[PDB]
Specification:
- By secondary structure, the protein is of the alpha/beta class.
- It has a single domain (about 1-165), classed as P-loop containing nucleotide triphosphate hydrolases (Rossmann fold), CATH 3.40.50.
- Helix content is about 35%, strand content about 25%.
- It has helices spanning about 15-25, 65-75, 85-105, 125-135, 150-165; strands at about 1-10, 40-45, 50-55, 75-85, 110-115, 140-145.
- It has a 6-stranded mixed sheet with strand order 2-3-1-4-5-6, sandwiched between helices.
- Helix 4 links the parallel strand 5 (about 110-115) and strand 6.
- It is globular.
- Bound molecules: guanosine-5'-diphosphate and magnesium ion.
- Magnesium ion binds next to helix 1.
Length: about 170
């Protein structure tokens, strides 16, 4: 069993918790406490290898955490999450990317850009815009819905596959 340490980052309210819960429980939770920050395990076979994913679902601002600090430092890959109907969350991605570059002292860090809430109509962030951002970072862009499960496995398993290239 191979362990992969994943960290889910992004603005409050974009569906970080919902994404993680969908992966773990196969259910959509719409009222997950915005302040609960914790790590979760998922045993799953990815491309023939039995993996134990260790996933930190980050939560909170202008306050420190021993667990989050540890995961930022030792995390092997990052899901950088915005919502396709939250323009500010997309614009925030730059600062999450800069934080990750600083924590790792590198511009070459396993990362996937995730545009969540893709089940809702009238997106305010175009696929093209997100693809452009991911291209500028040299990373994949994957759209997801924690509600319908669209893209959820894709996003997490792609991140594992990105780590394996490192
Ligand atoms: N329709 C829809 N709602 C979502 C999706 N993901 C999250 N939500 C809702 O968006 C809100 C914020 O989700 P949450 O997981 O708490 O975001 P977090 O602050 O990033 O952890 C909640 O009301 C969720 O029900 C999605 O893919 N589709
Ligand atoms: Mg949350």
């Amino acid at each position: 069993m191979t362990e992969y340490k994943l960290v889910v980052v992004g603005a409050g309210g974009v569906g970080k918790s919902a994404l993680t819960i969908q992966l773990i429980q196969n259910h959509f939770v719409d009222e997950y406490d915005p302040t609960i920050e914790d790590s979760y395990r998922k045993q799953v076979v990815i491309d023939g290898e039995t993996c134990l994913l260790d996933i930190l679902d980050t939560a909170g601002q202008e306050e420190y955490s021993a667990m989050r600090d540890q995961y930022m430092r030792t995390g092997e890959g990052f899901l950088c999450v915005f919502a396709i109907n939250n323009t500010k969350s997309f614009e925030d991605i730059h600062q999450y990317r800069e934080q990750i570059k600083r924590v790792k002292d590198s511009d070459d860090v396993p990362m996937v850009l995730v545009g969540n809430r893709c089940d809702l109509a009238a997106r305010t962030v175009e696929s093209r815009q997100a693809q452009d951002l991911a291209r500028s970072y040299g990373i994949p862009y994957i759209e997801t819905s924690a509600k319908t499960r669209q893209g959820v496995e894709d996003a997490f398993y792609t991140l594992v596959r990105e780590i394996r290239q490192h």
